A paper describes a structure:
The two gel-forming mucins MUC5AC and MUC5B constitute the main structural components of the mucus protecting the underlying epithelia in the respiratory system. The VWD assemblies are formed by the VWD domain, C8, trypsin inhibitor like (TIL) and E domains, except the VWD’ domain that only has the TIL and E domains. We determined the cryoEM structures of the wild type D3 assembly of the human MUC5AC mucin and the structural single nucleotide polymorphisms (SNP) variants Arg996Gln and Arg1201Trp that affect intermolecular interactions. The D3 assembly forms covalent dimers that can appear in two alternative conformations, open and closed, where the closed conformation dimers interact through an arginine-rich loop in the TIL3 domain to form tetramers.
The structure of the MUC5AC-D3 assembly was analyzed by cryoEM at pH 7.4. The cryoEM reconstruction of the D’-D3-CysD1 recombinant protein reached higher resolution (3.2 Å) than the isolated D3, even if only the D3 assembly is visible due to flexibility of the D’ and CysD1 domains. The covalent MUC5AC-D3 assembly dimer is formed via two intermolecular disulfide bonds, Cys1132-Cys1132 in the C8-3 domain and Cys1174-Cys1174 in the TIL3 domain. However, the Cys1132 intermolecular disulfide bond is partially reduced as observed previously in MUC2-D3. The MUC5AC-TIL3 β1-β2 loop, unlike the other mucins and VWF, is remarkably rich in arginines (20%). In MUC2 and VWF, the center of the TIL3 β1-β2 loop is located only 6.2 Å and 8.8 Å away from VWD3 β9, while in MUC5AC they are separated by 14.4 Å. During the 3D-classification processes, a second MUC5AC-D3 assembly conformation was observed. These were estimated to represent 17% of the total MUC5AC particles. Here the first mucin D3 assembly solved at neutral pH is presented. Interestingly no major structural differences were observed compared to the low pH.
Numbering used by the authors:
A (entry chain A), B (entry chain B): 899 to 1229
The structure:
Amino acid sequence: CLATCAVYGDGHYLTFDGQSYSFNGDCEYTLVQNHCGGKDSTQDSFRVVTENVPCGTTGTTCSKAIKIFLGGFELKLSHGKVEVIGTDESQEVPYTIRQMGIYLVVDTDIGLVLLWDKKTSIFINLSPEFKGRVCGLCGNFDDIAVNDFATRSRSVVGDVLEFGNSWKLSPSCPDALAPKDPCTANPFRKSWAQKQCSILHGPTFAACHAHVEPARYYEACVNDACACDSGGDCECFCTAVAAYAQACHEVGLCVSWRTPSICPLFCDYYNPEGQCEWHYQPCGVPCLRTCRNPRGDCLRDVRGLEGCYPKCPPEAPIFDEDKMQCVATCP
Amino acid sequence: CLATCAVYGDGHYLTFDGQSYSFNGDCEYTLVQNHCGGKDSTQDSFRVVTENVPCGTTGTTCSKAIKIFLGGFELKLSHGKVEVIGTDESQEVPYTIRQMGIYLVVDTDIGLVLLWDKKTSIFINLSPEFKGRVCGLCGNFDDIAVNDFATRSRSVVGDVLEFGNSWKLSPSCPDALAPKDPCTANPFRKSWAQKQCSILHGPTFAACHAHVEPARYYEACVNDACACDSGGDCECFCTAVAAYAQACHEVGLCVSWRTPSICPLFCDYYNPEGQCEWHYQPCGVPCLRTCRNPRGDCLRDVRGLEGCYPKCPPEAPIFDEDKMQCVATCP
Ligand SMILES: [Ca+2]
Ligand SMILES: [Ca+2]
């Protein structure tokens, strides 16, 4: 149906065609770039880049800020907030900002959306119309998992490190090098890392085990827990688990894995005094009535979004959508 | 009114009279022991001991299990569960187990209670009738903060290390030594530790700043965050903050400090499908109606207990207290 490019953790990548690899660097890297070369096929050119900074002590790097360039508009996503810099006094704003669950969903009219958790990871969804016309770190959308190493010169190179380094934006950035083993570097956290990441092989994800192989995700969890030693390994572990959770949710079946002792969420914080409407939905609501989305309309386009969601009462069931409450009606 | 002996974090102690110090060891240590020596004043003798294990890599130790001895009854508190070993087929069971908020409150008829968070810390409350007749790691209850160093031989010694080592249970245990500086040992976590523990000096605890000095608690938070490097520093930071939170709550005023990004609780997990009764009370309910506590009775003896609490509807407002729901009536 729709392909997905997933970037999460400490340089873990997943191409549109299904190829997976690992690469770490400290520079600006372009994930998806439209209109490769000078060929402009009467379409707008969109460019998304990520900023990586060295997090930890072994040498691993994680994404910190994401910049979006399209139609002369520049958007910045840092510290969990959206800041617009590039402003054009013409045409029409093509991006819409939505807050569904724990993700920061943005939508564009061209057919490209983003799923940002505001911490480390980012999910990219592309329409099938852009097949065979997109190049970048996510690989060419050609449904072939063996030719996803175009090093910006239309030349497939098996060197993953060279392929990653060939996509650097600033020429002055230092060249990336091969990483070490975080578990070997810090052998006093291996037992804790294994005990925490053993939940992937537990009976909770029995349904996911029959569709998605968890070996790669388990190894990623172990590596992240061994490397996330700069303070806040709980967030790294939660993101590593949520990556596989969203991957399994994309298939179509949802599984509840959260636990008050394992990555908890405070859904009651948004509830006002004397009221209770917010609830936790592991599978995410299909469609809800908001100010911009009337009751008669229901856009079932995105699936697999977990987080706190409100349950408006029958009286005043329209979500006001700007100050987190349900209202009778809005203009 | 009532004195309190608090043990939390990595060997942080607070005597009944108000003296505070720090000591780390790896053995069984007696906190409060009744009837010091051979003097039996026609009262039952209670003895509470704690088990410390080396947690981390610098050399700090934290409590893991707590054993209670009274009336020939032995109780064990490990892995967040209560296990009874010492059983006597005579007299009557003098202990009651209650689950209020996040603490595991146990009550005894003699006048001694315990507040266990099931993770690291333990709070002891003693009746004023036991003044000047209790010796142990909590010091003699004599309202004097300068003679709280009785090293089991009725001799006050200024050496905190010697005073702590003189209370070891097993003679074969190794003698404790002076600890090092965790922040100096791991200088790559100082910035993160300071950024996390700066919440104590923020405007949230402005009311607490006028009653309890937060310098000692801030130093304890910094040291714990620098030392808790074995995996799970979030739990260590949460316990360090909750210690000062409970200390301020004991004064009489309550302040809400929890945040969905700072030590969250999943109060919605206990809510059944289609119902919403559980809520988070920073100050704790004064009294609630349960199966063993009718509506006409309200025991207002303990204050300062935060956590998830249920709000039963007017219909069937009696808490069933054994399977987490509200029922109309129970025998
Ligand atoms: Ca390809
Ligand atoms: Ca004393």
